[model samples]
Target: MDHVYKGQLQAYALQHNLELPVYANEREGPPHAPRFRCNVTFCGQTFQSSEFFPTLKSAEHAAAKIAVASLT
Candidate 1:
């Protein structure tokens, strides 16, 4: 679900000539449990995913989904 949403978000952004930038803030966590806050900005609006993800790839997807929802 995440991957699908992620692709859709990027595709939508490309189709609309929007810039989608995903950034992350690394946090202190053990190897068993990593943490980071992810943000994605589109159409001059930025959104941060409410949940933390283990990897930026995952985090970006979450953020993109949120942004996509807002745009659509």
Candidate 2:
């Protein structure tokens, strides 16, 4: 995966010496086509996935993207 936002978030965390954490917060849909919602913690703020994603990894990435956009 490209993980552009996750890399950015990692860089930000490195600069601030903070541990970035990811949470798999929720899920929906059937087992064969489940959806995920995730969140990330940065700068004392919680950045959450705006919508459900097909993959938990993408959900986490989206939350980090939001976190990167908001906190950095």
Winner by lDDT: 2
* Distance from true location, Cα of 22 in model 1, Å: 4.6
Question: lDDT for each of the candidates?
Answer: 0.74, 0.75
Lowest lDDT block of 10, candidate 2 = 19-28
lDDT (0-100) at residue 24 of candidate 2? 49
Model 2, 1-72: lDDT tens per residue?
Answer: 457887787877888888765554677888798988787776678877557888878888788777888864
For model 2, the superposed segments whose C-alpha errors exceed 4 Å read none
lDDT of 2: 0.75
lDDT of 1 at 21: 53
Task: Give residue 39's error in model 2 in angstroms.
Answer: 0.8
- TM-score of candidate 2 to 2 decimals: 0.75
- Residue 14 miss distance in model 1 (angstroms): 2.4
Show where candidate 1 strays beyond 4 Å: 20-27, 30-32
